[PDB]
Amino acid sequence: IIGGEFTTIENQPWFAAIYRRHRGGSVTYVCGGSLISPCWVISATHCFIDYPKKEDYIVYLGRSRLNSNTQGEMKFEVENLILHKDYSADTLAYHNDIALLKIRSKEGRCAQPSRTIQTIALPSMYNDPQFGTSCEITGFGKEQSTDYLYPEQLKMTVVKLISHRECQQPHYYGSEVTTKMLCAADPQWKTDSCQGDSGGPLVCSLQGRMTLTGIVSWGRGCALKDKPGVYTRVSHFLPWIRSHTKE
Amino acid sequence: CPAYSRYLDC
């Protein structure tokens, strides 16, 4: 996250922190995700495409810090790692950048809601807020595009939804942005997601409810003029989601 | 990697 504030898991209790275990015993952060039901965390396919083995991954919930423990966190194994069949990566962007992780603790239990762990609601199909709506993004991503280290404390910021019409202008993304994607940015270009925030939630208030409206997917640079964050448009994937989870 | 990825491994 570029700009915005430090926060704690309590303000974003659906945020999942996803890590990869390495062959030399080392364990490193991969991506964010969101708890959409007790056994299910949604994220981005591109996070897992290079190393498709569900056994390499650990998911934490209730976690406010990147490399140290938070009181109230719960560790999970991944029972299945469901990647989109139609995922693809361009020279620029990702398509169908959505993934599901079914989680269980070594004790075979799914998420118990907590002061620090809550599920987030999916939107109604094809139902999105209007351009110019303020929304929240959360992550452990870089605080500046040039950093080599990630912050230790979770962060969040607010961005505004951009119209597909405006997102497609040539000095913004053009034809790279499809209707399966949502753009969002600061009107002054001062805040944005960044590397290491991918997979994480874009959360908007849609008809009263805090709704998961997008998944951090890509953008050129972080907080760069005319270059908004781009997100997977969740409302366009409900049937994919219902297929894979109604199990 | 795609040129505009915000993935940590990219």
Author numbering:
A (entry chain U): 16 to 37, 37A, 37B, 37C, 37D, 38 to 60, 60A, 60B, ...
B (entry chain P): 1 to 10
What is written in the article reporting this PDB entry?
One interesting member of the trypsin family of serine proteases is urokinase-type plasminogen activator (uPA), which catalyses the conversion of the zymogen plasminogen into the active protease plasmin through cleavage of plasminogen's Arg15–Val16 bond (using the chymotrypsin numbering). From a phage-displayed peptide library, we previously isolated a serum-stable, disulfide bond-constrained peptide, CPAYSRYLDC, termed mupain-1, which competitively inhibits murine uPA (muPA). While being unable to generate crystals of muPA, we did manage to crystallise huPA-H99Y, a murinised version of human uPA which, in contrast to human uPA wt, is able to bind mupain-1, although with a somewhat lower affinity than muPA. In the complexes, the inhibitory peptides adopt cyclic conformations with an overall Ω shape.
We determined the structures huPA-H99Y in complex with mupain-1 (CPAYSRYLDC) itself as well as with either of two other inhibitory peptides, namely mupain-1-12 (CPAYS[4-guanidinophenylalanine]YLDC) and mupain-1-16 (CPAYS[L-3-(N-amidino-4-piperidyl)alanine]YLDC). Beginning from the N-terminus, the cyclic peptides approach the active site of huPA-H99Y from the 99-loop, insert residue 6 into the S1 pocket, and exit the active site towards the 37-loop. In each of the structures, the amino acid in position 6 of the peptide, i.e., Arg, 4-guanidinophenylalanine, or L-3-(N-amidino-4-piperidyl)alanine, forms polar interactions to Asp189, Ser190, and Gly218 in the S1 pocket. In particular, Arg35 forms polar interactions with peptide residues Tyr7 and Asp9 and Tyr99 forms polar interactions with peptide residue Ser4. In the enzyme-peptide structures, the peptides are constrained by two type I tight β-turns (Pro2-Ala3-Tyr4-Ser5 and Tyr7-Leu8-Asp9-Cys10) and three intra-peptide H-bonds (Pro2 O – Ser5 N; Seri5 Oγ - Tyr7 N; Ser5 Oγ - Arg6 N). The overall conformation of the peptide backbone on the enzyme surface is quite similar to that of the reactive centre loop of plasminogen activator inhibitor-1 (PAI-1) in its Michaëlis complex with uPA S195A, aligning into the active site in a substrate-like manner. However, compared to PAI-1 in its Michaëlis complex with uPA S195A, the scissile bond of mupain-1 in its complex with uPA-H99Y is shifted approximately 0.5 Å away from residue 195. The distance from the Ser195 Oγ to the carbonyl group of the P1 residue of mupain-1 and derivatives is too large (approximately 3.9 Å) to allow the nucleophilic attack associated with catalysis. Moreover, the distance from the oxygen atom of the carbonyl group of the P1 residue to the amido group of the Ser195 is too large (approximately 4 Å) for formation of a polar interaction, implying that oxyanion stabilisation cannot take place. The observed effect of Ala-substituting the peptide's Ser5 is in good agreement with the fact that the binding of mupain-1 to huPA is dependent on the substitution of its His99 with Tyr, shown here to be able to form a hydrogen bond with Ser5.
